[PDB]
Design a protein around this ligand. Structure first.
Ligand SMILES: [Zn+2]
Ligand SMILES: [Zn+2]
Lengths: 307, 307
RNA sequence: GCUUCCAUAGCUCAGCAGGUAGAGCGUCAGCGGUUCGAGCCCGCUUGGAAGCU
RNA sequence: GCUUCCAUAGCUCAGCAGGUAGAGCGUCAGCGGUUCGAGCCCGCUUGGAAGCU
């Protein structure tokens, strides 16, 4: 599981930063990648990474904003252009269906795969046995969300060499044991899987605030979270500039992380008004509030380890 | 007047070539630039050129195809994002209005300028005193066009130093003369402007075939034209591969130019299946039919001089 | 970096319609182009002043 | 270059459901990871075979 930022920009593309799109790699977790927001030219950034279209299972959009979605049409099309048969679900706000649907239609684009578009709302927007992705409304205007990708706890490791020392040959009967199931051994022996198990490994969590003004909702969404990808469009001083555009300030994101007891904070969606010099300044403004902070940047990849 | 190719690709972006978009620079001609097709990330390519959004007066689309239009939303938006107040007219086929209109709407994008969208059809799609842009149907499916940008003849140079030798002080009365008008001089003198004029300078012409199969219509559209930007998706041999996808072959474009008596041919919309090595091979296949041919490539700029 | 707007005799402010350059007490920043003609229109290169959703 | 699919004892063809490796006359290409356990799942690096709207 790794975070690979494909565009850390804001408003419009700049040679320094492309418009927003953060990729959550879950290849060894579920064999795929999830994009969060897909600003224009996101597929283009990808051609510089090892992330491949067909490997994207689901795109989550934070709020309808060309710098967050003008990249869907061309991306999905490319996935179809290169084969891709798996299903892809786009999760977004009201408007996302129309946008995607119209774009393909006018372009007479027939997708060689199943496209599920879901216009979400607060609460669980996707869940299975491995992950639970809850969304929430953020301060940036009606139809704006912050997402939390929560990986559910994984089972404890199998005390395999106790099973062996008990003369229980390693084989299928093993995974049944790994599942807590009580089984009957070839020797009419009965053991309770649960007995030979290690305490469960807590699962990772990543949060994407999207575009928003300092919010208490968001604070709660990222509780104890592992990584909170937070947008910091402005420096500390421009507190007013942020409020009016419904954005946030480095120091603001940092307070948020600290208050949420998040483990790490990544500042993204930086405005071109700051330089490759200010970028470390922006970062410092945050580090003074929340030690473990990082100013995201195009192609920065941050692995998320099992704490 | 110069042709600056912003994407010479085909189907999908490649680090070598971005998807289609050719810019016709008319800065010293009418203070602006016209884009022909605006594939995704076209604005991005621009950030590497001196062409600026606000400087684009009108985008002409050849046929609805994501690799030709997924770039409008983000481009127009950016023009609005950076001020821009001049009017911008997008000329395209049926579908272009819906696409542009829906994209801005869902994104709640209010344009700080007037946007005129015109869903064209064969014939003159724009004309004034300087230019006449005629469009035509090409072989690539209903709603596919090839454009000819025809600059109208400019007036002959003023025989100024004959006017002087005739003791006619240079001043306003001059441009009236440059206009053929017969005027009355400060000394109740009467001269016929037309008399002191040089033969008119013939005006330049550029053609954009767009995506199409070898066509006789196209051949006629580019008659005597100066530059014919022609799509050559395939090499000579893949004649069948081209026919089926409604595309063209180097040799085909070259025949076309030769037959049209075009002055120069630029091969574009190259498929990634060819390399930076094949690209000169592709070009050679054409040069054997039409000497003056060039394989377009990202950021190639070709000025169009007054022959 | 991006976008836009400025560098007019000795100071301020024009020249907000290309016609040998002004109003109060001068190589119109530079090189080049368009043009009959450029401070005024288009490139390029220097120096400044805002804003960057 | 892109995408996908291959490199299984001596040849062909499996192993198209992770459980000390097969059917006709073997370091499952290599290094590393996940896992109790990997030819089989995920990276990386070598060599091939198509197609690239
Ligand atoms: Zn945004
Ligand atoms: Zn095309």
């Amino acid at each position: 599981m790794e975070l690979l930022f494909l565009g850390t920009g804001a408003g419009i593309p700049a040679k320094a930063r492309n418009v927003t799109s953060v990729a959550l790699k879950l290849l060894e977790e579920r064999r795929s990648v999830w994009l969060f927001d897909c600003g224009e030219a996101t597929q283009h950034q990808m051609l510089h990474t090892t992330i491949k279209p067909r490997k994207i299972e689901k795109i989550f959009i934070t709020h309808m904003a060309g710098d967050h979605v003008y990249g869907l049409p061309g991306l999905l099309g490319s996935r179809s252009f290169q084969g891709g048969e798996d299903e892809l679900t786009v999760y977004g706000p009201k408007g996302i269906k129309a946008f995607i649907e119209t774009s393909l239609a006018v372009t007479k684009t027939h997708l060689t795969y199943p496209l599920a578009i879901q216009e979400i709302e607060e609460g669980i927007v996707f869940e299975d046995d491995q992950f639970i992705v809850t969304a929430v409304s953020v301060i940036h205007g009606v139809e704006a969300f912050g997402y939390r990708v929560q990986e559910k706890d994984v089972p404890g490791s199998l005390k395999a060499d106790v099973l062996k020392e008990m003369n229980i040959p390693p084989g299928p009967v093993y995974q049944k044991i790994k599942k807590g199931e009580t089984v009957t051994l070839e020797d009419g022996r009965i053991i309770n899987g649960n007995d030979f198990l290690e305490p469960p490994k807590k699962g990772r969590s990543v949060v994407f605030s999207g575009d928003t003004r300092v919010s208490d909702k968001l604070k709660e969404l990222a509780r104890d979270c592992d990584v909170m990808v937070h947008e910091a469009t402005f420096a500390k001083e421009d507190r007013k500039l942020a409020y009016d555009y419904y954005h946030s300030t480095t120091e603001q994101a940092a307070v948020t992380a600290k208050e949420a007891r998040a483990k790490q904070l990544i500042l993204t969606h930086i405005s071109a008004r700051y330089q490759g010099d200010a970028s470390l300044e922006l970062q410092k403004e945050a580090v003074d509030v929340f030690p473990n902070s990082v100013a995201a940047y195009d192609f920065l990849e941050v692995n998320v380890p099992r704490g």
